[PDB]
Write a protein that holds these residues in place. Structure first.
Motif, PDB file in Angstrom:
ATOM      1  N   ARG A 197       0.835  -1.206   0.000  1.00  0.00           N
ATOM      2  CA  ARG A 197       0.000   0.000   0.000  1.00  0.00           C
ATOM      3  C   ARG A 197       0.865   1.249   0.000  1.00  0.00           C
ATOM      4  O   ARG A 197       0.619   2.184  -0.769  1.00  0.00           O
ATOM      5  CB  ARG A 197      -0.951   0.040   1.202  1.00  0.00           C
ATOM      6  CG  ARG A 197      -2.166  -0.918   1.181  1.00  0.00           C
ATOM      7  CD  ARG A 197      -2.902  -0.938   2.519  1.00  0.00           C
ATOM      8  NE  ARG A 197      -4.105  -1.768   2.455  1.00  0.00           N
ATOM      9  CZ  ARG A 197      -4.661  -2.384   3.483  1.00  0.00           C
ATOM     10  NH1 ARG A 197      -4.137  -2.319   4.694  1.00  0.00           N
ATOM     11  NH2 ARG A 197      -5.783  -3.076   3.290  1.00  0.00           N
ATOM     12  N   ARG A 198       1.888   1.276   0.859  1.00  0.00           N
ATOM     13  CA  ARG A 198       2.759   2.457   0.927  1.00  0.00           C
ATOM     14  C   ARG A 198       3.547   2.659  -0.370  1.00  0.00           C
ATOM     15  O   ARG A 198       3.894   3.811  -0.716  1.00  0.00           O
ATOM     16  CB  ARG A 198       3.703   2.337   2.123  1.00  0.00           C
ATOM     17  CG  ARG A 198       3.009   2.437   3.469  1.00  0.00           C
ATOM     18  CD  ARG A 198       3.969   2.630   4.640  1.00  0.00           C
ATOM     19  NE  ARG A 198       4.967   1.576   4.750  1.00  0.00           N
ATOM     20  CZ  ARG A 198       4.836   0.499   5.510  1.00  0.00           C
ATOM     21  NH1 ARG A 198       3.744   0.298   6.230  1.00  0.00           N
ATOM     22  NH2 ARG A 198       5.828  -0.395   5.562  1.00  0.00           N
ATOM     23  N   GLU A 199       3.856   1.573  -1.079  1.00  0.00           N
ATOM     24  CA  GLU A 199       4.546   1.607  -2.359  1.00  0.00           C
ATOM     25  C   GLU A 199       3.620   1.937  -3.515  1.00  0.00           C
ATOM     26  O   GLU A 199       4.111   2.201  -4.620  1.00  0.00           O
ATOM     27  CB  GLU A 199       5.220   0.256  -2.621  1.00  0.00           C
ATOM     28  CG  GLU A 199       6.380  -0.079  -1.693  1.00  0.00           C
ATOM     29  CD  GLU A 199       6.819  -1.535  -1.828  1.00  0.00           C
ATOM     30  OE1 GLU A 199       6.019  -2.337  -2.365  1.00  0.00           O
ATOM     31  OE2 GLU A 199       7.940  -1.875  -1.387  1.00  0.00           O
ATOM     32  N   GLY A 200       2.311   1.932  -3.282  1.00  0.00           N
ATOM     33  CA  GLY A 200       1.351   2.188  -4.340  1.00  0.00           C
ATOM     34  C   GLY A 200       1.229   1.071  -5.353  1.00  0.00           C
ATOM     35  O   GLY A 200       0.865   1.329  -6.516  1.00  0.00           O
ATOM     36  N   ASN A 201       1.494  -0.167  -4.948  1.00  0.00           N
ATOM     37  CA  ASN A 201       1.506  -1.306  -5.874  1.00  0.00           C
ATOM     38  C   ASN A 201       0.085  -1.847  -5.915  1.00  0.00           C
ATOM     39  O   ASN A 201      -0.267  -2.794  -5.209  1.00  0.00           O
ATOM     40  CB  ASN A 201       2.508  -2.359  -5.448  1.00  0.00           C
ATOM     41  CG  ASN A 201       2.629  -3.482  -6.442  1.00  0.00           C
ATOM     42  OD1 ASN A 201       1.676  -3.759  -7.206  1.00  0.00           O
ATOM     43  ND2 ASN A 201       3.725  -4.231  -6.369  1.00  0.00           N
TER      44      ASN A 201
END
Ligand SMILES: O=C(O)Cc1c[nH]c2ccc(Br)cc12
Length: 126
Positions: free
Chosen positions: A61-65
Motif C-alpha cells: 500500500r505504501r509503495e502504491g503497488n
C-alpha cells in the motif's frame, strides 16, 4: 525487500502445512497428546504468518503497488476463512468432538488448497 519478506512469510506457511499434515496423522491415530502440541505449534505459526502478511500488505500500500494490494486483500481475507476454520477445529478438540474435528480439518485443507494459485500470484506481483 517486500519480495524477500514474502518468501519468508511463505516458508512459514509451508511450515504450517508440514505441521498440519503431521497433526492430521496424529489425530487419525488417536494420539491426543501429540495433537495438543501440534495445535499449539500451529497457532503460533498462524499468528506469525498473519502478522507477516499484514506487513507485506501495508508495504505494498505504501509503495502504491495497486495490483499487489488487490491480490493481498483477497488472500488475507481467505487467510481469515482458514484461521476461523482452524479455531473451530481447536474448539472441537477441546470439546472431544472428533466428528466436528474431522469436518473442520477437511475444510481447512480445501480452503488452503484453493488459495494456492493466489499465493503464487502474489509472489510474482510484488
Ligand atoms: O495466517 C493468517 O494470515 C491468519 C491466521 C491466524 N490464525 C490462523 C490459523 C489457521 C489458519 Br489456516 C490461518 C490463521
Amino acid at each position: 525487500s517486500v519480495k524477500s519478506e514474502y518468501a519468508e512469510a511463505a516458508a512459514v506457511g509451508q511450515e504450517a502445512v508440514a505441521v498440519f499434515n503431521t497433526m492430521k496423522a496424529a489425530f487419525q491415530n488417536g494420539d491426543k497428546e501429540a495433537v495438543a502440541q501440534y495445535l499449539a505449534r500451529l497457532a503460533s505459526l498462524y499468528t506469525r504468518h498473519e502478522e507477516l502478511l499484514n506487513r507485506i500488505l501495508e508495504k505494498a500500500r505504501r509503495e502504491g503497488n495497486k495490483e499487489a494490494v488487490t491480490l493481498m486483500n483477497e488472500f488475507t481475507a481467505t487467510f481469515q476463512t482458514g484461521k476461523s476454520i482452524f479455531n473451530a477445529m481447536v474448539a472441537a478438540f477441546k470439546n472431544g468432538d472428533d466428528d466436528s474435528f474431522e469436518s473442520y480439518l477437511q475444510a481447512l485443507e480445501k480452503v488452503t488448497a484453493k488459495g494456492e494459485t493466489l499465493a503464487d500470484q502474489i509472489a510474482k506481483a510484488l
